[PDB]
């Protein structure tokens, strides 16, 4: 049921969590935010780090 990401879709595939603990979305599909692999260090979503 829950939706995520900037695309407002259900979970699928590999997803990353915003490192802003105040993020209102938290989880993002890799493809939606241009990722190919897990970031090894910090990662902030396009809404938190515009």
């Amino acid at each position: 049921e829950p939706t995520y990401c900037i695309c407002n879709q259900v979970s699928f595939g590999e997803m990353v969590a915003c490192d802003n603990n105040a993020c209102k979305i938290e989880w993002f599909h890799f493809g939606c935010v241009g990722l190919k692999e897990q970031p090894k260090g910090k990662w902030y979503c396009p809404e938190c780090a515009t």
Binding site: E14, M15, V16, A17
Partner: peptide, 6 residues
């Protein structure tokens, strides 16, 4: 960064 695989 944290990730998950669904």
């Amino acid at each position: 960064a944290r990730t998950k695989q669904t």
